[PDB]
Write a protein that binds this ligand. Structure first.
Ligand SMILES: [Mg+2]
Ligand SMILES: [Mg+2]
Ligand SMILES: [Mg+2]
Ligand SMILES: [Mg+2]
Lengths: 75, 96, 113, 137
RNA sequence: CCAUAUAUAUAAUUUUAAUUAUAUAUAAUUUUAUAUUAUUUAUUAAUAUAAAGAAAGGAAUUAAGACAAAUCAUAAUGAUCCUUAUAAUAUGGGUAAUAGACGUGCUAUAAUAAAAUGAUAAUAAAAUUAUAUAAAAUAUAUUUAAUUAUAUUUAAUUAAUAAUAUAAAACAUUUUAAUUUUUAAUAUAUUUUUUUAUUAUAAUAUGAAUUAUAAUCUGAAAUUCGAUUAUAUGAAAAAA
RNA sequence: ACUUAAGCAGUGGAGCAUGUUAUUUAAUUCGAUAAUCCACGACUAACCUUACCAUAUUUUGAAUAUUAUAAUAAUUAU
């Protein structure tokens, strides 16, 4: 969770298929922490309408998935 | 303060032992609050009333001699008949 | 097929609408799953235990359905089904509370002087 | 100072109860409301057809004591020795039936002893509630 | 009917606040004696003086018209409309987006005014605690302690008993940019926390938005989108 | 005679909070419009609340009654 002593908030994710077949992981779980082992994987994050595709880098670790799928248009 | 810490620690440990209290000088988050937290289940579930109540449906079983007229259902049935008479009835539900 | 929710929940004895039914479902399922959720939270929040057990408990907590969460229970009026301005002393919205107080249905309530 | 020259402020409220456990008090209020509605529903009785009697009764007074509940209510109705009319059967199931009388079921409902007290009013203008319910029809 | 002032009852003054608590009852719409001025002229008002007074405030309580209503969320019944959808469940998002525009409040723009401190603890009321409250103590921020915030642990109380909770302004001392009205070195004094003499000496120590780091609280979950702490930041805000 | 005029006490140019409006949005749930002015309920919107958007997904569903097959009992008699 948020408090660092509580650790990251982990949720179920079909990661093993994406660790072997290189397929993207399509998820609505915007509240899941990006663990260090998520690096290099392709995610498709729901933003309420569509699925933004992103590739996880080391700078994204610690942050959460929904931070890179904007829910609203800027203007 | 002037009294040493070791004596107070021994007192605290021994007193916790007597009154069936757990002693955690380390300050580590054991989480005993969860074990000692009271349960709120039954009161939360009893919000809307006990679900076992005598209903009008049950009356025919309970008192065969007495014939009870529920006026609201009669009104609803008569209204359905009135809409039935004018062809304003609900379309038949699709069969799966 | 027969019922909206996974588990069979008995009907509330009073006024009924969809939101009251959802509230009652979540309330009863919270009753049934409270002990399990509390045990999972204990195993997750107990830093004495190995980190793997804590993470397993957290993941199992995340896996639970919405009708087991404590926060999702919201107090609603038992006479109209409204969810706002509900007085927990009578579990009625301010309007239904007003009418019942005027009619004398609420024990002990009176008009202010 | 005298009970023949004033009405107790307790009698103002339909449900007159005090419980240290406030949740039980709220539960009892809700139960009183629901059982009052059910009692309302049970007041119409037809024999075959063209014999639809409608008993008009005021709101119920739920007297909550420590070891007992009493549901007091007033009602209006309308060779008689040798048979039973519908209203008499209704009252006898309220209290007198041996097997499945209403007060036993209400006792299981409330988890305390229950009794029901119907009182007949021979006129309609001796009670505002009964009078209003009558002129409504 | 409240409030107020009294009387009786009740409490074995350790549920103590008897200065209190809640039942009954009384009391006022104040009563009077004069003087002056007006008066429909006294068996009247305006005042003022004297006397007995605790006596000075308040709410509610009815109908008749007329307008406005669908967050008429102040409802009922009826009319019409959907019935693989305008009904129902789950996941996520949104209701928080910003060129702007106007209301409502909070914080400020300094000295008739802000800050720090003030343990045998300056002084309240009304509330709340079985779907709780959390005392004292220990530990970390952090530093001899104090304060403040979390962490560990639950002492009593389910209550006129214990806790939320040592009320705060008030008052006392000290400091406070603009201010060369200040501080500093020498002397100096019957102003000594101080005086004198010679040299030296537009946004601040107001304001806290915004931004960054790292922690913490609730909850299963704080990214969109919560609150809190510390360490850096330090905007606009002066006149009319 | 409401209300005004006067006297007093304020508040009132900035930041933020919170509303409404406009615009945008997939939705930004709902509120006013016959020319002064006025779309303006919040006793707490992260999920629920929720009423809106997207995607899946349920079809007598929340109740009353009818007519039938299966188990449970009670009796009479399987
Ligand atoms: Mg809630
Ligand atoms: Mg400052
Ligand atoms: Mg939802
Ligand atoms: Mg939501």
């Amino acid at each position: 969770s948020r408090s660092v002593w509580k650790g990251p908030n982990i949720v179920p994710l079909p990661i093993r298929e994406a660790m072997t077949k290189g397929t993207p992981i399509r998820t609505n779980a915007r509240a899941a922490t990006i663990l260090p082992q998520f690096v290099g994987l392709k995610f498709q994050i729901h933003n309420g309408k569509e699925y933004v595709p992103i590739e996880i880098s080391e700078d994204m670790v610690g942050h959460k998935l929904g931070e890179f799928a904007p829910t609203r248009k800027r203007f | 303060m002037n009294v040493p810490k070791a004596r107070l620690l021994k007192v605290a440990e021994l007193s916790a032992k007597i009154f069936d209290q757990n002693f955690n000088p380390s300050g580590i988050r054991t989480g005993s609050k969860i074990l000692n937290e009271r349960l709120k289940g039954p009161s939360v579930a009893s919000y809307y009333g006990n679900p076992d109540i005598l209903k009008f449906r049950h009356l025919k079983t309970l008192y065969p001699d007495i014939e009870f007229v529920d006026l609201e259902e009669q009104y609803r049935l008569s209204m359905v008949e009135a809409k039935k008479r004018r062809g304003k009835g609900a379309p038949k539900k699709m069969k799966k | 097929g027969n019922f909206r929710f996974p588990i069979k929940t008995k009907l509330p004895p009073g006024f009924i609408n969809a939101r009251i039914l959802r509230d009652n479902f979540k309330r009863q399922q919270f009753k049934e799953n409270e002990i399990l959720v509390k045990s999972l939270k204990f195993i997750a929040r107990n830093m004495n235990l190995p980190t793997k057990l804590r993470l397993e408990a957290q993941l199992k907590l995340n896996a639970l359905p919405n009708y087991m969460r404590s926060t999702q229970i919201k107090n609603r009026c038992v006479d109209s089904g409204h969810a706002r301005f509900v007085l927990s002393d009578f579990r009625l919205c301010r309007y239904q509370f007003r009418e019942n107080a005027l009619k004398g249905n609420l024990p002990g309530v009176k008009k202010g002087i | 100072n005298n009970k023949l020259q004033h009405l107790n402020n307790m009698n103002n409220w339909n449900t007159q109860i005090y419980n240290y456990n406030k949740n039980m008090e709220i539960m009892n209020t809700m139960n009183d409301k629901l059982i009052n509605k059910l009692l309302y529903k049970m007041m119409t009785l037809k024999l075959n057809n063209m014999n639809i009697n409608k008993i008009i009764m005021s709101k119920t007074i739920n007297q909550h004591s420590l070891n007992k509940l009493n549901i007091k209510f007033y009602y209006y109705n309308n060779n008689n020795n040798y048979y039973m009319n519908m209203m008499n059967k209704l009252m006898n199931i309220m209290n007198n039936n041996m097997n499945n009388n209403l007060c036993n079921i209400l006792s299981y409902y409330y988890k305390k002893k229950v009794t029901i007290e119907p009182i007949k009013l021979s006129y309609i203008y001796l009670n505002s509630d009964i009078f209003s319910k009558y002129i409504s029809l």
